[PDB]
Ligand binder design. Structure first.
Ligand code: NAG
Ligand code: NAG
Length: 139
């Protein structure tokens, strides 16, 4: 028996514990419009720091999920979170073919044991994958 899941791409940007989407934890899932301070980490990632109680925690967020509104003197930048997700044509979640899925994108996927949820795009000829943490299942 095959099954289908109705999913909605979350209204958040992904502040991960590493500059990678695969095998990373969310330090923050900042609602769209959240104001943050960040530093450029590499060509595609920003980094910054939050407080988990008494502990400083470093996080990484993809360049397209942070709209830079001003640059500070000290090299850091002020940005507003631009919430969106990705699906990839590979289970590395790193380059290849990927689609920017707008916040609130409604999709249908299938139960995935390995946590790479399939999205068939009609207009493309192929399967893309989205990790669990980028969407909600409507109950
Ligand atoms: C990513 C981000 O915005 N980090 C800031 C940090 O830079 C700042 O020192 C602190 C002040 O409370 O609050 C955190 O939210
Ligand atoms: C959405 C996506 O996977 N983007 C990746 C980025 O994470 C990575 O830093 C870089 C490696 O050079 O290649 C980009 O294509």
């Amino acid at each position: 028996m095959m099954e289908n899941i109705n999913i909605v791409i979350k209204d958040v940007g992904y502040f991960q514990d590493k500059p990678q989407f695969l095998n990373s934890k969310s330090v923050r899932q900042w609602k769209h419009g959240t104001k943050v301070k960040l530093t450029k980490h590499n060509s595609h990632w920003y980094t910054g720091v939050v407080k988990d109680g008494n502990k400083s925690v470093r996080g990484y967020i993809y360049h397209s999920m942070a709209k830079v509104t001003s640059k500070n003197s000290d090299g850091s930048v002020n940005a507003t979170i631009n919430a969106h997700a990705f699906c990839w044509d590979n289970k590395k979640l790193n380059g290849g073919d990927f689609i920017n899925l707008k916040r609130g994108f409604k999709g249908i996927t299938h139960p995935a044991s390995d946590g790479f949820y399939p999205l068939y795009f009609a207009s493309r000829k192929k399967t893309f994958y989205i990790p669990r943490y980028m969407f909600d299942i409507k109950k």
